[PDB]
Amino acid sequence: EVQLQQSGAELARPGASVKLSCRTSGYSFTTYWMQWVRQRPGQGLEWIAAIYPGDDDARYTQKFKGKATLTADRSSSIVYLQLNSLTSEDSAVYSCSRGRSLYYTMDYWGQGTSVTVTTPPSVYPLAPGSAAQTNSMVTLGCLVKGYFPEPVTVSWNTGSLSSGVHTFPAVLQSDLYTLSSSVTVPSSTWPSETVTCNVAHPASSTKVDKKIVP
Amino acid sequence: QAVVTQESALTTSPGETVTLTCRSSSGAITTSHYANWIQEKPDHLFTGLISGTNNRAPGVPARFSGSLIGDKAALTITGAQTEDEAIYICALWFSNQFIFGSGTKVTVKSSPSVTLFPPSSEELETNKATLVCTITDFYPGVVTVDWKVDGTPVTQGMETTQPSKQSNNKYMASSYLTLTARAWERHSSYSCQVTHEGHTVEKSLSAA
Numbered sequence A: 001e002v003q004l005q006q007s008g009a010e011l012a013r014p015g016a017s018v019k020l021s022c023r024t025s026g027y028s029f030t031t032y033w034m035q036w037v038r039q040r041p042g043q044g045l046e047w048i049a050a051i052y053p054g055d056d057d058a059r060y061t062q063k064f065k066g067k068a069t070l071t072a073d074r075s076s077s078i079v080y081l082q083l084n085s086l087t088s089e090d091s092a093v094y095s096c097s098r099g100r101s102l103y104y105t106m107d108y109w110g111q112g113t114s115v116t117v118t119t120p121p122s123v124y125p126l127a128p129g130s131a132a133q134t135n136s137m138v139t140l141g142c143l144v145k146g147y148f149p150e151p152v153t154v155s156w157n158t159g160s161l162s163s164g165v166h167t168f169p170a171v172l173q174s175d176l177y178t179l180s181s182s183v184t185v186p187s188s189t190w191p192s193e194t195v196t197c198n199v200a201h202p203a204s205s206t207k208v209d210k211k212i213v214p
Numbered sequence B: 001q002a003v004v005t006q007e008s009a010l011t012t013s014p015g016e017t018v019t020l021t022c023r024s025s026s027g028a029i030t031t032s033h034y035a036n037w038i039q040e041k042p043d044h045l046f047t048g049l050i051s052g053t054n055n056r057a058p059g060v061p062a063r064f065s066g067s068l069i070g071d072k073a074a075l076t077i078t079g080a081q082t083e084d085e086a087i088y089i090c091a092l093w094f095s096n097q098f099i100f101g102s103g104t105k106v107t108v109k110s111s112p113s114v115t116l117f118p119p120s121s122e123e124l125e126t127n128k129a130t131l132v133c134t135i136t137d138f139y140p141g142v143v144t145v146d147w148k149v150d151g152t153p154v155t156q157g158m159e160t161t162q163p164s165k166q167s168n169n170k171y172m173a174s175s176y177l178t179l180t181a182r183a184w185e186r187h188s189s190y191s192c193q194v195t196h197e198g199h200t201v202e203k204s205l206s207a208a
């Protein structure tokens, strides 16, 4: 029962500076190390810095010693990694893991947050037909059309609907992405119970909850 | 910096045993490099396997073993699983930071489930019509989708994704048929057809 959840996708202009965050649940926030790694477009993980929450001991490396600061909020079990003066160089996926010592470390991680250094989506609800409602399982869907850039975060019932969810790979057609997400539930569940897909496009500060009705 | 190296890729079979090496450009890898192996699965899903050169982490199938074999640090997989297919990253300690390897990628039949969705009322109103065909549950990840309108094949206005490995160790993809409200009503049916491993699967929906 250990999980480190990170903040959402981040789109930033060059020269600016983002504030990322990793929150821990399931262990001694203060008696454990917190490291940050990043993965550029296809360049293997790079070590950035680490912090010991319950003793505010943050250790950096030559490379990031300048644009990378790291703080802890022992009162929320959250660690902020802040990067200053952003460059195309910094566009990557920042993840975070924990560690007790050089012998035991980097076992659990976060899903990682993507930073990119805009046009919002049009969300359309997709009600099931004869080729979606299939006896015991009916599957609703959401068309997230013409947005830019990646990514979009699609959720169902604010995350309550976690199983049977399938977000398909986006497709590019004229510098505009369009993707689809589906969720399957028991044919008794809907229309009976409400089903809403929550789409979020960090890049454009846009969030759309579209109720999927029959 | 001290560049760490690994084997690009490795094709293995179930049950077998595979060994992955991790060689350092600084020289011999020792217990002071606190070798650490990390498993990476689709969508940046990192998982700890071995730290401190040879200590299995909580929840690690004993088939996984870390040990120093020569000037190298290696990971041994005694008893392959289909789920054990992934990217293996070793990390060597170099006083004050871990240096990672670009990763070793190890490789280890289901018919697809087709799901069509007709245009959204809202979208139709914009005189647009997007037919959605979401393809799932298939392996190997290699399909050919074709769209038919009134039993006749259509080439234009079709967008199909790239297979994506799912957590259930199966691929999924999606195809789109972009039409005009006109065209959508102007026809009797639309057929999303998928061809996979020799056989074909197809579904259809009628504007009617």
Ligand SMILES: C[C@]12CC[C@@H]3c4ccc(O)cc4/C(=N/OCC(=O)O)C[C@H]3[C@@H]1CC[C@@H]2O
Binding pocket: A033, A034, A035, A050, A051, A059, A060, A098, A099, A100, A101, A102, A104, A105, A106, B095, B096, B097
């Ligand atoms: C890799 C690690 C984060 C980075 C820490 C670091 C970072 C920089 C540095 O110069 C030395 C050290 C160590 N030096 O001395 C140890 C201390 O005095 O306790 C302990 C490392 C930590 C071990 C567990 C965690 O995952």
